[PDB]
Amino acid sequence: TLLDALNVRVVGSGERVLVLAHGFGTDQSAWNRILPFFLRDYRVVLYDLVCAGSVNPDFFDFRRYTTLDPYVDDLLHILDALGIDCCAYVGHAVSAMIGILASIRRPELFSKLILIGASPRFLNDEDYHGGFEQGEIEKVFSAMEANYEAWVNGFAPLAVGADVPAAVREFSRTLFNMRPDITLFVSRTVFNSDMRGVLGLVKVPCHIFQTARDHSVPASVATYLKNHLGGKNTVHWLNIEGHLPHLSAPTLLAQELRRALS
């Protein structure tokens, strides 16, 4: 029933497992345009985080999903249920972190992690530039709660960054699918987490995919990850603007994935 609730799907003609894990505001459909590049060499595993608008909101238990741990639990449950003993993992934003944490708990499960638009911490402090001040973040939450639609319309073009209208709409609609309720709660969960202290525990190689002008991830956060993740790290400086390259420049992003995977 968890595989059903989280919309777990296994496609492709290959034998090597590749899992694609969406970030906040989207669901697994965000990979639709990447997918074709991997169907013939891989067994591709996709799923939706509980907070995706495509998952029954009855399954979003506010007394459970207060931190990333249960998200990790869900991932690890999927992989065990599918009988996966080793895979390559691609995670966008929050799913980058979920991947990190999963790898630490089950290092045998991952051959490689690929992180797209990852950050261990959004908030600035003494010696760390995360991109956001405590004030800023709060004004986001009050904008979201006051008028959810107005917020989506102002946030989506910024998240996409580049002028790709089709992408803005697609991101808009998956944000709109989410119950405003949950979007608020999940955002709190994320903007307030500090993953910095875990990075050194990672031992699996990580490829850090970083776009130009990512509104939620400064260029230095990519370097920081490269410097702190405890395994062998490669940074991929994408010639793409925005935080959602899988929606905005899918052919370009797929080519880099293919390269990172070899």
N residues, the chain: 262
Exposure on the CB side of residue 175, measured as CA atoms within 13 A: 21
78 vs 10, 88, 108, CA distance in Å?
Answer: 11, 14, 15
Type of residue at 65: Y
Identify the DSSP state of 35.
G
Tokens standing for residue 243: 């935080």
211 touches 238 (CB < 8 A):
yes
Q: How many CB atoms lie within 10 A of CB 131?
A: 17
Distance CA 222, CA 114 (A): 12
For tokens 């490829």, name the residue: 207
Tokens standing for residue 231: 């395994």
For strands 9-11 and 42-47, give the pairing: antiparallel
Distance CA 27, CA 13 (A): 23
Q: CB neighbours of 54 closer than 8 A, spacing ≥ 6?
A: 7, 27, 28, 29, 48, 174, 177
Helices (H), the chain: 2-5, 69-81, 94-105, 134-146, 148-160, 165-177, 180-191, 219-228, 245-248, 250-260
For tokens 């249960």, name the residue: 70
Tokens standing for residue 36: 């074709």
In DSSP terms, which residues pair with 208 in a beta bridge? 115, 235
**Deposited resolution, Å:** 2.8
Q: CB neighbours of 186 closer than 8 A, spacing ≥ 6?
A: 24, 51, 65
| Packing angle, helices 134-146 and 148-160, rounded to 10 | 130
210 touches 235 (CB < 8 A):
yes
Distance CA 233, CA 216 (A): 21
Distance CA 217, CA 60 (A): 27
Q: Three-state DSSP class for 239?
A: strand
Identify the DSSP state of 84.
-
For tokens 């741990």, name the residue: 69
Q: Which of 224, 216, 223 is nearest to 237 (CA)?
A: 223
In DSSP terms, which residues pair with 18 in a beta bridge? 44, 88
Exposure on the CB side of residue 24, measured as CA atoms within 13 A: 25
Distance CA 115, CA 91 (A): 5
Q: CB neighbours of 102 closer than 8 A, spacing ≥ 6?
A: 72, 75, 76, 89, 109, 110
Intra-chain end-to-end CA distance of the chain, in Å: 34
Q: Strand order of the sheet with strand 87-92?
A: 9-11, 42-47, 16-21, 87-92, 110-116, 206-212, 233-241
Q: How many CB atoms lie within 10 A of CB 196?
A: 16
Phi, psi of 111 (to 5 degrees): -90, -25
Identify the DSSP state of 249.
S
Largest CA distance in the chain: 49
For tokens 């003609």, name the residue: 13
Q: Which domains does the chain have, with CATH numbers?
A: 1-262 (3.40.50.1820)
The technique is: X-ray
In DSSP terms, which residues pair with 45 in a beta bridge? 10, 19
> SS in 3 state form for 99-157?
HHHHHHHCHHHEEEEEEECCCCCCECECCECCCECHHHHHHHHHHHHHCHHHHHHHHHH
